[PDB]
Design an enzyme around this catalytic site. Structure first.
Site, PDB file in Angstrom:
ATOM      1  N   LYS A 125     -57.056 -53.738 -21.804  1.00 14.01           N
ATOM      2  CA  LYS A 125     -56.351 -53.578 -23.073  1.00 14.01           C
ATOM      3  C   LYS A 125     -54.984 -52.928 -22.870  1.00 14.01           C
ATOM      4  O   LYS A 125     -53.998 -53.334 -23.501  1.00 14.01           O
ATOM      5  CB  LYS A 125     -57.204 -52.766 -24.043  1.00 14.01           C
ATOM      6  CG  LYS A 125     -56.650 -52.669 -25.448  1.00 14.01           C
ATOM      7  CD  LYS A 125     -57.617 -51.911 -26.329  1.00 14.01           C
ATOM      8  CE  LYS A 125     -57.172 -51.891 -27.764  1.00 14.01           C
ATOM      9  NZ  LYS A 125     -55.944 -51.078 -27.913  1.00 14.01           N
ATOM     10  N   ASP A 126     -54.880 -51.962 -21.956  1.00 10.12           N
ATOM     11  CA  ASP A 126     -53.579 -51.354 -21.701  1.00 10.12           C
ATOM     12  C   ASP A 126     -52.686 -52.228 -20.835  1.00 10.12           C
ATOM     13  O   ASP A 126     -51.462 -52.115 -20.919  1.00 10.12           O
ATOM     14  CB  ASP A 126     -53.755 -49.979 -21.073  1.00 10.12           C
ATOM     15  CG  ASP A 126     -54.262 -48.964 -22.065  1.00 10.12           C
ATOM     16  OD1 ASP A 126     -53.967 -49.122 -23.267  1.00 10.12           O
ATOM     17  OD2 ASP A 126     -54.953 -48.012 -21.653  1.00 10.12           O
TER      18      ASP A 126
ATOM     19  N   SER B 266     -61.439 -37.410 -26.593  1.00 11.93           N
ATOM     20  CA  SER B 266     -60.508 -38.175 -27.409  1.00 11.93           C
ATOM     21  C   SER B 266     -60.949 -38.173 -28.872  1.00 11.93           C
ATOM     22  O   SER B 266     -61.993 -37.628 -29.236  1.00 11.93           O
ATOM     23  CB  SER B 266     -60.389 -39.597 -26.875  1.00 11.93           C
ATOM     24  OG  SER B 266     -59.912 -39.597 -25.543  1.00 11.93           O
TER      25      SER B 266
ATOM     26  N   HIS C  66     -58.608 -34.646 -21.503  1.00 10.29           N
ATOM     27  CA  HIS C  66     -59.900 -34.923 -20.883  1.00 10.29           C
ATOM     28  C   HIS C  66     -60.860 -33.750 -20.970  1.00 10.29           C
ATOM     29  O   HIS C  66     -62.073 -33.955 -20.881  1.00 10.29           O
ATOM     30  CB  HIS C  66     -59.717 -35.309 -19.422  1.00 10.29           C
ATOM     31  CG  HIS C  66     -59.116 -36.657 -19.238  1.00 10.29           C
ATOM     32  ND1 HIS C  66     -58.667 -37.114 -18.021  1.00 10.29           N
ATOM     33  CD2 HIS C  66     -58.906 -37.660 -20.121  1.00 10.29           C
ATOM     34  CE1 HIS C  66     -58.194 -38.340 -18.162  1.00 10.29           C
ATOM     35  NE2 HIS C  66     -58.326 -38.694 -19.428  1.00 10.29           N
TER      36      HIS C  66
ATOM     37  N   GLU D  18     -26.475 -41.204 -30.271  1.00  2.70           N
ATOM     38  CA  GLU D  18     -27.409 -42.314 -30.207  1.00  2.70           C
ATOM     39  C   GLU D  18     -28.571 -42.057 -31.158  1.00  2.70           C
ATOM     40  O   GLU D  18     -28.964 -40.908 -31.381  1.00  2.70           O
ATOM     41  CB  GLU D  18     -27.888 -42.516 -28.768  1.00  2.70           C
ATOM     42  CG  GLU D  18     -28.661 -43.801 -28.531  1.00  2.70           C
ATOM     43  CD  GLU D  18     -27.840 -45.048 -28.810  1.00  2.70           C
ATOM     44  OE1 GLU D  18     -26.607 -45.032 -28.620  1.00  2.70           O
ATOM     45  OE2 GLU D  18     -28.438 -46.052 -29.239  1.00  2.70           O
TER      46      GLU D  18
HETATM   47  C1  HEM Z   1     -44.001 -37.031 -22.541  1.00  2.01           C
HETATM   48  C2  HEM Z   1     -44.469 -37.961 -23.365  1.00  2.01           C
HETATM   49  C3  HEM Z   1     -45.914 -38.058 -23.573  1.00  2.01           C
HETATM   50  C4  HEM Z   1     -46.796 -38.680 -22.767  1.00  2.01           C
HETATM   51  C5  HEM Z   1     -46.499 -39.397 -21.483  1.00  2.01           C
HETATM   52  C6  HEM Z   1     -48.063 -38.528 -23.357  1.00  2.01           C
HETATM   53  C7  HEM Z   1     -49.170 -39.079 -22.734  1.00  2.01           C
HETATM   54  C8  HEM Z   1     -50.375 -39.103 -23.367  1.00  2.01           C
HETATM   55  C9  HEM Z   1     -51.490 -39.767 -22.883  1.00  2.01           C
HETATM   56  C10 HEM Z   1     -51.526 -40.572 -21.617  1.00  2.01           C
HETATM   57  C11 HEM Z   1     -52.490 -39.550 -23.758  1.00  2.01           C
HETATM   58  C12 HEM Z   1     -53.866 -40.110 -23.625  1.00  2.01           C
HETATM   59  C13 HEM Z   1     -53.850 -41.453 -24.350  1.00  2.01           C
HETATM   60  C14 HEM Z   1     -54.420 -41.308 -25.730  1.00  2.01           C
HETATM   61  O1  HEM Z   1     -55.160 -40.390 -25.972  1.00  2.01           O
HETATM   62  O2  HEM Z   1     -54.114 -42.193 -26.689  1.00  2.01           O
HETATM   63  C15 HEM Z   1     -52.001 -38.735 -24.795  1.00  2.01           C
HETATM   64  C16 HEM Z   1     -52.749 -38.306 -25.869  1.00  2.01           C
HETATM   65  C17 HEM Z   1     -52.268 -37.414 -26.816  1.00  2.01           C
HETATM   66  N1  HEM Z   1     -51.037 -36.938 -26.923  1.00  2.01           N
HETATM   67 FE1  HEM Z   1     -49.525 -37.356 -25.693  1.00  2.01          FE
HETATM   68  N2  HEM Z   1     -47.982 -37.834 -24.498  1.00  2.01           N
HETATM   69  C18 HEM Z   1     -46.698 -37.515 -24.697  1.00  2.01           C
HETATM   70  C19 HEM Z   1     -46.107 -36.814 -25.735  1.00  2.01           C
HETATM   71  C20 HEM Z   1     -46.875 -36.224 -26.705  1.00  2.01           C
HETATM   72  C21 HEM Z   1     -46.387 -35.440 -27.742  1.00  2.01           C
HETATM   73  C22 HEM Z   1     -44.955 -35.099 -27.997  1.00  2.01           C
HETATM   74  C23 HEM Z   1     -47.458 -35.048 -28.498  1.00  2.01           C
HETATM   75  C24 HEM Z   1     -47.383 -34.204 -29.692  1.00  2.01           C
HETATM   76  C25 HEM Z   1     -47.384 -32.889 -29.568  1.00  2.01           C
HETATM   77  C26 HEM Z   1     -48.619 -35.624 -27.924  1.00  2.01           C
HETATM   78  C27 HEM Z   1     -49.878 -35.431 -28.429  1.00  2.01           C
HETATM   79  C28 HEM Z   1     -50.975 -36.137 -27.969  1.00  2.01           C
HETATM   80  C29 HEM Z   1     -52.273 -36.064 -28.607  1.00  2.01           C
HETATM   81  C30 HEM Z   1     -52.613 -35.258 -29.821  1.00  2.01           C
HETATM   82  C31 HEM Z   1     -53.080 -36.864 -27.908  1.00  2.01           C
HETATM   83  C32 HEM Z   1     -54.531 -37.113 -28.189  1.00  2.01           C
HETATM   84  C33 HEM Z   1     -54.733 -38.416 -28.947  1.00  2.01           C
HETATM   85  C34 HEM Z   1     -56.201 -38.746 -28.910  1.00  2.01           C
HETATM   86  O3  HEM Z   1     -56.848 -38.765 -27.738  1.00  2.01           O
HETATM   87  O4  HEM Z   1     -56.796 -38.988 -29.934  1.00  2.01           O
HETATM   88  N3  HEM Z   1     -48.229 -36.346 -26.827  1.00  2.01           N
HETATM   89  N4  HEM Z   1     -50.689 -38.469 -24.524  1.00  2.01           N
END
Ligand code: HEM
Ligand SMILES: CCCCCCCCCCCCCCCCCC(=O)OC[C@H](COP(=O)(O)OCCN)OC(=O)CCCCCCCCCCCCCCCCC
Ligand code: HEC
Ligand code: HEM
Lengths: 238, 57, 75, 49, 65, 101, 378
Positions: free
Chosen positions: G226-227, G204, G200, G270
């Site tokens: 949508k979600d 995005s 945030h 697994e």
């Molecule tokens: C613990 C598990 C994870 C959760 C719960 C999580 C949760 C979220 C959420 C809620 C968003 C916002 C939704 C969205 O932007 O589409 C997000 C975006 C993002 N996450 Fe994660 N995430 C997780 C793991 C990861 C991992 C492992 C990475 C890689 C390093 C990652 C990288 C990103 C990136 C780059 C975005 C931005 C995508 C965008 O806004 O274009 N996330 N994540």
């Protein structure tokens, strides 16, 4: 040294909305009680599980009052045996594991709770095991071990028990080899999954819910995104 | 098309009326759907369940 | 990042109609299925040719693993 | 006990082919087996530890 | 007291690649019976022909029960 | 030799895909502080056409529909407009670096 | 005026859930944030009920799990919901990382680093949870991966007879793994909120990679519904797997009790470690293998410091798009090699698959970005 894969059988619970034959569960339990309850154990199933599945309440109380339990102490308190109504498991023909191993010719037999769900294959493995004894073509067979292809190593310390001394079912269902083997395989499927009936009931209700609901949620998604799908731009400079 | 006009006029104009409507619909639909799915699951086997053979026993 | 100081845009008129008076699925089997055939044509040239090479490697590995599991001498 | 292609021992974790005396031939194991402290006594016995 | 297993098993192996692999098995068994203690177990043939007969009996077993 | 390279460049520009959504070469530029400076140094009418082409591209990826064939901005009629501004920005950045070194 | 813009909690709820400026061209790959979050609250809730009916003692741990599955009302639905929700959790996680790598969201640094820390936390949580039922495969996989942590020279030996709680896997090892399988998902939740905080902060990323600061729409009532649709599809898949095929994922070797003397030949963990476990036995060396595993996920760390492109997406770099799908094929090959025993053709193609893995991510994607840098007058 290979792995023979078991075949595929058209079971009566094979279809995705099909259940077990509860009558076959009854006569498969009859098979387990007659012949199989001297080497194998099934220590995670009680008689009270059978109170609604394949017996009534009184019949299972009789079947659990036939067996001594050796309950614990009394007022003086050595130990004493007991009939036992429902709170008893299926009692342990050989007490210790190594006492079971030394009673047999080694190779203590595994318990029969999770055999169907734990052998890289369903009850087809148990069926082909129990029916597939045959001729050994020029192998070792070290003095007590029989030949059966559906087993890793092709050497089993289990004497073939399925047709030798047929058990004479109570109902009068004719005791062949395949029918008694199918009965005990159905019962072992039940002893693996006590929830199969009700889980496919809830699977049917979930299929009807997600067929009746998910198109409406998709309609409401398209109805709220309907504005931005139809929005249209134009370019005004001076 | 007239059949939805009085439906909107009586059960969707307010909010509390809408909430009472979906609650009464939830109870009635719960009863009818449980009876329907029980009938479907009995019909899909008809020879295998404990119920009919136990009242034959 | 708040809502109102994003950028500076002039010269743009936007039309958009109410959600009730327009239909939900506008000719859903007259634009949607040629649309997804268009998207399918624009992708599989870069989607498929890894996967089929994986599939051939999979079948070759299984086949040669069994044929080198079984020896068959003669005496 | 008696697996593989060399006749002897065999680790199923990462395909380590041991021999009958338990020595690494084909695998990612750098070391051999451990020889424990053993004392033979004439009752056809051995104290091992 | 005759099980239908025996009936459908002896029925389904009548004339087939089942029988071809059985004769292949008799080839390897005669090959080792005319040989002084070789390695050839003549067992792979047993696995694949009983695989064939058990698939064809698997299609046609549980109907008559 | 010459037109073979031109064939490669024109084929890659057809198979890129942003020409099908009404974009030119400098409406899909990555932003660091340099390109933010170059966007800040633009004139007015090109900036208004830039935000209009970007807004049409976001609309036509919002309903995921590609423009009809006749409105695709082909090769060698696009404006390579951002190139001198961005060139002067990178030259000034390297000037700061190699002066303070 | 408005409670939603003055109340101190509702300022946070309004700035994160309703009045958030979001881009307008989201495709279905932007659901997996909500899918991972709803999987997280579902795993926490089902896990809390499992932790109410569980007794961690090595004599009666497996009997306690059997008691859950047979005797407690619907405890079988909660147990299978927890296990299959873990598998769907890692499915949604790898879809999420695939989106974040493919659409060039790795130009955001701090969110990416917090993400990689969440990846390590979920992997350790999954491993401890898979130890907990105290089965055959659980016991021996615990032994194998703890000895993987013993591969560290001069420090790892005392470290691993420390986290064994002695000299073998004992009651203390099961209770340690229970306490940390409990406490790690709340750390996952807190780092998920920090992840959300930095996202945030930056803003995005749309599928084009063009900066969408001109066409922002609010979050509600568009992406909320949508979600909700995405979570309804997820709940459909989870109920489908726990009501028709529990056999599709669970390892059948696990269900025998933990005999400390068997060691079956089928020894695979697994499946969502098999993209990583096959990297280990690709190398015929110990320290090289454990270092190559750590360096694979550190290659996921050092993704942004090789981004030598000039357009952030891969929607307009078709050669990098092709090499991305070759990388996906290579990872699924590594999973299949992880699911197979260790002999000669599998050894050859496992070595070649791991070497092509590092060659595709480290080398060929910046080489392709350089060739389209040089091809388009840049
Ligand atoms: C613990 C598990 C994870 C959760 C719960 C999580 C949760 C979220 C959420 C809620 C968003 C916002 C939704 C969205 O932007 O589409 C997000 C975006 C993002 N996450 Fe994660 N995430 C997780 C793991 C990861 C991992 C492992 C990475 C890689 C390093 C990652 C990288 C990103 C990136 C780059 C975005 C931005 C995508 C965008 O806004 O274009 N996330 N994540
Ligand atoms: C996977 C199934 C195949 C999905 C597929 O074909 O997606 C096509 C889509 C095309 O993308 P594009 O052409 O750029 O966009 C068109 C929009 N007008 O491409 C996409 O939507 C790609 C977005 C998803 C990419 C990842 C999907 C697999 C998830 C696992 C990736 C693992 C990555 C590495 C992790 C460990 C290291
Ligand atoms: C005593 C003799 C019996 C009797 C009456 C039965 N079984 Fe069998 N069984 C026995 C032993 C000693 C063993 C172990 C052999 C070994 O260690 O290899 C077994 C094994 C089995 C198995 C195991 C197959 C596997 O491990 O994959 C099964 C499924 C099995 N036995 C089933 C079974 C059934 C259904 C019986 C009633 C007909 C039965 N056994 C009788 C010893 C004995
Ligand atoms: C803090 C919340 C959690 C608690 C209290 C919890 C508790 C438990 C318990 C008691 C078990 C053993 C029960 C059993 O396996 O039958 C278990 C198993 C497991 N848990 Fe969790 N868990 C939690 C969160 C998670 C999360 C976030 C994941 C990862 C998605 C996870 C993955 C697993 C797995 C894979 C198993 C093994 C399941 C099996 O094979 O039977 N758990 N958990």
């Amino acid at each position: 040294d290979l792995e023979l894969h078991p075949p595929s059988y058209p079971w009566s619970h094979r279809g995705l909305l099909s259940s077990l034959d509860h009558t076959s569960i009854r006569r498969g339990f009859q098979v387990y009680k007659q012949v199989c309850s001297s080497c194998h154990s099934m220590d995670y199933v009680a008689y009270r599980h059978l109170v609604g599945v394949c017996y009534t309440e009184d019949e299972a109380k009789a079947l659990a009052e036939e067996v001594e339990v050796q309950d614990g102490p009394n007022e003086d308190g050595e130990m004493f045996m007991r009939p036992g109504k429902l709170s008893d498991y299926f009692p342990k023909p050989y007490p210790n594991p190594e006492a079971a191993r030394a009673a047999n010719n080694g190779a203590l037999p595994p318990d029969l709770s999770y055999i169907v769900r734990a052998r890289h294959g369903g009850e087809d493995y148990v069926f082909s095991l129990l029916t597939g004894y045959c001729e050994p073509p020029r192998v070792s067979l070290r003095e007590g071990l029989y030949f059966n292809p559906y087993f890793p190593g092709q050497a089993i310390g289990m004497a073939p028990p399925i047709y030798n001394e047929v058990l004479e079912f109570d109902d009068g269902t004719p005791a062949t080899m395949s029918q008694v083997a199918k009965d005990v395989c159905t019962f072992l499927r039940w002893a693996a999954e006590p929830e199969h009936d009700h889980r496919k009931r809830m699977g049917l209700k979930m299929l009807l819910m997600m067929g009746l609901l998910l198109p409406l949620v998709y309609a409401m998604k398209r109805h709220k995104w309907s504005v931005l799908k139809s929005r249209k731009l134009a370019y005004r400079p001076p | 098309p007239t059949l939805t006009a009085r439906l909107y006029s009586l059960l969707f104009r307010r909010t509390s009326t809408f909430a009472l409507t979906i609650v009464v619909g939830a109870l009635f639909f719960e009863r009818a759907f449980d009876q329907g799915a029980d009938a479907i699951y009995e019909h899909i086997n008809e020879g295998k369940l404990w119920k009919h053979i136990k009242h034959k026993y | 990042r708040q809502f109102g100081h994003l950028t500076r845009v002039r010269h743009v008129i936007t039309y958009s109609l109410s959600p009730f008076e327009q239909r939900a699925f506008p000719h859903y089997f007259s634009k949607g299925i040629p649309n997804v055939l268009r998207r399918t044509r624009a992708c599989i040239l870069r989607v498929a040719p890894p996967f089929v090479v994986f599939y051939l490697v999979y079948t070759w590995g299984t086949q040669e693993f069994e044929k080198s599991k079984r020896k068959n001498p003669a005496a | 006990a008696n697996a593989g292609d060399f006749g002897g021992y065999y680790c199923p974790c990462h395909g380590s082919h041991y021999d009958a005396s338990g020595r690494i031939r084909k695998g990612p194991a750098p070391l051999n087996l451990e020889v424990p402290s053993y004392e033979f006594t004439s009752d056809d016995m051995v104290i091992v530890g | 007291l005759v099980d239908p297993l025996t009936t459908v098993r002896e029925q389904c192996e009548q004339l087939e690649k089942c029988v071809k692999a059985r004769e292949r098995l008799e080839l390897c068994d005669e090959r080792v019976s005319s040989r002084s203690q070789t390695e050839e177990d003549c067992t792979e043939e047993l696995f694949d022909f009983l695989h064939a007969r058990d698939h064809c009996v698997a299609h046609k077993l549980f109907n008559s029960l | 030799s010459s037109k073979w390279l031109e064939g490669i460049r024109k084929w890659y520009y057809n198979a890129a895909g942003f020409n099908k959504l009404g974009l030119m070469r400098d409406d899909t530029i990555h932003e660091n502080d340099d390109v933010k400076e170059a966007i800040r140094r633009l004139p007015e009418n090109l900036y208004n056409d830039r935000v209009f082409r970007i807004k049409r591209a976001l609309d036509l990826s919002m309903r995921q529909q590609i423009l009809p064939k006749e409105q695709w901005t082909k090769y060698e009629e696009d404006k390579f407009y951002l190139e001198p501004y961005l060139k002067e920005v990178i030259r000034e950045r390297k000037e700061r670096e190699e002066w303070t070194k | 005026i408005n409670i939603r813009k003055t109340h101190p909690l509702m300022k946070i709820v309004n700035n994160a859930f309703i009045d958030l400026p979001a881009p307008s061209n989201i495709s279905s790959w932007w659901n997996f944030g909500s899918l991972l979050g709803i999987c997280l609250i579902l795993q926490i809730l089902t896990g809390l009920f499992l932790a109410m009916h569980y007794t961690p003692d090595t004599t009666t741990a497996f009997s306690s799990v059997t008691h859950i599955c047979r005797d407690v009302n619907y405890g079988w639905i909660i147990r299978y919901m927890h296990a299959n929700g873990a598998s769907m959790f890692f499915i949604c996680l790898f879809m999420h990382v695939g989106r974040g790598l493919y659409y060039g969201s790795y130009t955001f640094l701090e969110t990416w680093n917090i993400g990689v820390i969440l990846l390590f936390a979920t992997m350790a949580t999954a491993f401890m949870g898979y130890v907990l039922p105290w089965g055959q495969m659980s016991f021996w996989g615990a032994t194998v991966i703890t000895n993987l942590l013993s591969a560290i020279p001069y420090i790892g030996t005392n470290l691993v007879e420390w986290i064994w709680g002695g000299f073998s896997v004992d009651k203390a090892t099961l209770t340690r793994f229970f306490a940390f399988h409990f406490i790690f998902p709340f750390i996952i939740a807190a780092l998920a909120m920090v992840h959300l905080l930095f996202l945030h902060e930056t803003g995005s990323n749309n599928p084009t990679g063009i900066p969408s600061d001109t066409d922002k729409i609010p979050f509600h009532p568009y992406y909320t519904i949508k979600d909700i649709l995405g979570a309804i599809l997820l709940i459909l898949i989870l109920m489908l797997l726990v009501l028709f095929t529990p056999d599709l994922l669970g390892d059948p070797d696990n269900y025998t009790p933990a005999n400390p003397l068997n060691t079956p030949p089928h020894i695979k963990p697994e499946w969502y470690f098999l993209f990583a476990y096959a990297i280990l036995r690709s190398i015929p060396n110990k320290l090289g293998g454990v270092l190559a595993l750590v360096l694979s996920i550190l290659v996921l760390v050092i993704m942004p410091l090789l981004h030598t492109s000039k357009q952030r997406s891969m929607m307009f770099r078709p050669i990098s798009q092709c090499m991305f799908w070759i990388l996906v094929a290579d990872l699924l090959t590594l999973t299949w090699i992880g699911g197979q025993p260790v002999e000669h053709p599998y050894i050859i193609i496992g070595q070649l698959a791991s070497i092509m893995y590092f060659l595709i991510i480290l080398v060929m994607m910046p080489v392709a970005s350089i060739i389209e840098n040089n091809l388009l007058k840049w």
